[PDB]
Amino acid sequence: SPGIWQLDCTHLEGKVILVAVHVASGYIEAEVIPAETGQETAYFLLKLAGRWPVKTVHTDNGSNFTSTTVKAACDWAGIKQEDGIPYNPQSQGVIESMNKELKKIIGQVRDQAEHLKTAVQMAVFIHNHKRKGGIGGYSAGERIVDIIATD
Amino acid sequence: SPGIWQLDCTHLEGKVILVAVHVASGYIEAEVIPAETGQETAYFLLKLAGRWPVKTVHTDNGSNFTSTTVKAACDWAGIKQEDGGVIESMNKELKKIIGQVRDQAEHLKTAVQMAVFIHNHKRKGGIGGYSAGERIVDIIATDIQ
């Protein structure tokens, strides 16, 4: 489905990073958050939901996703929350170990950023622009818009 | 025109909101930021450029839009900065929707995202219309084709 996203929370350098993956394309967004709280998790979800037509989230069942505040945000936004449904992209080319991918790219750009939060965004950018399937292929960023475009 | 955005700040409830408009579509992104600063602008632009193919940003050239960190982020992302009333009209529209939905969240920052959601997903017109979110994606997907 075009409306399905995988959400997880990971950590790096002792900081909290929320990650959203559009399962059909491999497109990601990610951000460092100050604390792993329901409110921060709800805010992130709400931002995501206003960008894209988000219908279903699969989560890692981390405690943050079990906050009432997250359920309220999903209810408001008309998102079906599905905790504990594993990430196992079926599309050819969609990377299966995404927190690992993201962290590998962060290491490739970290020395350009005074603070990790900036490095995370540079890494998201690189991930989304990477061409998959050879020189004739497409990036995740191209595939998400192709998939989600209605007309 | 698929790569052209306008970016400004607007003020509500003693807080700063940083607003971006994709001119061709009317799609918006916006967030409460803690202060009207160059570091916040650069961070927002890097996030924007990882999502959409941003080629040109037009701003009012306040200091928070022209710092050396904003330039470094724009250069890295491939964004051309220009000195460029679509965003002014959108500041007012965004504030109007925030007012209309304000009772559904305690914190302004939440209400701002609710307003962005409503603005981006509301179908314009009748049967046959599109939302702004659908327009931006159709424009970009068409441009890649």
Q: How far apart are CA B122 and CA B134, in angstroms?
A: 10
Tell me which chain B residues have a C-beta less than 8 angstroms from the C-beta of A122. 46, 76
Domain architecture of chain A: domains with CATH = 1-151 (3.30.420.10)
Backbone angles phi, psi at A35, to 5 degrees: -155, 145
Tell me which chain A residues have a C-beta less than 8 angstroms from the C-beta of B141. 145-146, 148-149
Experimental method: X-ray
> Long-range contacts made by residues B18-23, C-beta under 8 angstroms, separation at least 24?
B18/B44, B19/B87, B19/B90, B19/B91, B19/B94, B20/B44, B20/B48, B20/B57, B20/B87, B21/B86, B21/B87, B21/B90, B22/B52, B22/B136, B23/B86
Which chain B residue's Cα is nearest to A49? Answer: B117
CB A17 within 8 A of CB A47: no
Contact A77 B117 (CB under 8 A): yes
Q: How far apart are CA B133 and CA A115, in angstroms?
A: 32
Q: Helices (DSSP H) in B64-128: which residue ranges?
A: 68-77, 86-101, 108-121
Q: How far apart are the first and last CA of chain A?
A: 17
- Per-residue tokens: B43: 């961070």
Residue to substitute from B28, B102, B117, interface A, most A β-carbons within 10 A: B117
Rg (Cα) of chain A, in Å, rounded?
15
Which chain B residue's Cα is nearest to A116? Answer: B43
* CA-wise closest residue to B44 among B60, B28, B61: B28
Reported resolution in A?
1.4
Interface of A with B in 69-98 (CB under 8 A): 76-77
Beta-strand (E) ranges in chain A? 4-12, 15-22, 28-33, 56-59, 80-83, 131-132, 138-139
CB B132 within 8 A of CB B26: yes
